[PDB]
Ligand binder design. Sequence first.
Ligand SMILES: Oc1ccc(/C=C/c2ccc3ccccc3c2)cc1O
Ligand SMILES: Oc1ccc(/C=C/c2ccc3ccccc3c2)cc1O
Lengths: 114, 115, 114, 115
Amino acid sequence: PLMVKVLDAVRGSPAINVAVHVFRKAADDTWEPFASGKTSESGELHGLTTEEEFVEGIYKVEIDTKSYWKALGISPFHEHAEVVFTANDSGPRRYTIAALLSPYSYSTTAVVTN
Amino acid sequence: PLMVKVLDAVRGSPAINVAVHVFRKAADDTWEPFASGKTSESGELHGLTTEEEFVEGIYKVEIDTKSYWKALGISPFHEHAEVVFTANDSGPRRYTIAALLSPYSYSTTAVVTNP
Amino acid sequence: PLMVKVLDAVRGSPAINVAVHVFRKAADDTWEPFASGKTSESGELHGLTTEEEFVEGIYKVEIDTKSYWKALGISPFHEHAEVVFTANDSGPRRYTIAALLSPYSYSTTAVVTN
Amino acid sequence: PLMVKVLDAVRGSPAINVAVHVFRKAADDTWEPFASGKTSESGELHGLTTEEEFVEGIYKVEIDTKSYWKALGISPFHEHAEVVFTANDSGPRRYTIAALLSPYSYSTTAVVTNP
Ligand SMILES: Oc1ccc(/C=C/c2ccc3ccccc3c2)cc1O
Ligand SMILES: Oc1ccc(/C=C/c2ccc3ccccc3c2)cc1O
């Protein structure tokens, strides 16, 4: 139900071994840890959750961009990239959160398919 | 020292009347409200802070993209666009945070200048 | 050796049935037709060329963004999106040209892997 | 009526001294040179054209990204960034073409205003 894809706009490559943390907003308006992992050689993180676990709610995907740039010897601007969205059941739904990284910029899009 | 510029990639226009909230990370590791405002007819938000008040720290610029799209009658994907960065750690700098918005996407960049 | 991926930033979806034309710069500095197709249900165009055909040179990938937006009833700014690059043999190489489309904007990146 | 703004996503700075060439599609379907210039210390290129000269047509703004990166000693992917659009077909408009550059990527957006 949830896939994250990270790309590097400087090297023209997948962003490999990037830490990604997913949080779910709790009733108290705090961020509860939900799922995490590191992107693969293809810049992808699969297997974060299941259809049963991935209920409607507000989610935050935090991408550890700062550690990624520092490991390549590059000085980055952001502490991290955050993607905050509502999961809405309206029909069978798969969410791909994509991020394209530069040292002083990032782009993110959602690809939501059935 | 801190300016926010927001553009709309659907209309090809400035993003007008976008709410922006700035937070600064406190000693307790919580987000303290720092400043807020709305973008103008040019999509710009000036006057958030002063050189004196804009000290070193970790800042979060929250751009209320969902409220923007919903006011135009559109159901967007994201709740907001968050830009989190350390500022002024090598002395005072001027920061422009620019954002380009679509209903299911956004881009942000920083322009950092030494006055 | 060459894959094109097109995404829609308005709908949060692959950009389906987008016409893509690839040109190679000829000795006369004109653009010779090289490969073309339409993106699939996943927004991808595979099978454009072979390793034997895809020699070093300057290539142009033209994405018919205007027809895409018009088919969705949306008024777009650009006539097309053009991606112009040199193919360089430096080692085994696969090129993915990705484009993320909005009515008044687009982003493109290259993912070049071995 | 036509302004170009270029930013560098690696340095977090304006992209200075970027060559820009503008072409207009002729009756013969060829690209006629229209105007050209270089971005300033602010990454901006003003004064390309006038309201009188900037008639209806299909225009191509070519941003010489490869020459920019190569002058900084970097080997980039793209030859240039091309922005192709119909202009002034509903009367005169003001166009800002903005570009955000990385060695293997770029983003472009248009801001179109009615004077
Ligand atoms: O500005 C941007 C430009 C491109 C992308 C995404 C590109 C891409 C490329 C390949 C993909 C394969 C599977 C799923 C999503 C995939 C997404 C995102 C941006 O924010
Ligand atoms: O993907 C992107 C594409 C274009 C822009 C444009 C940003 C801009 C455009 C014009 C500006 C004029 C004055 C000061 C800052 C300005 C900033 C931003 C993106 O994230």
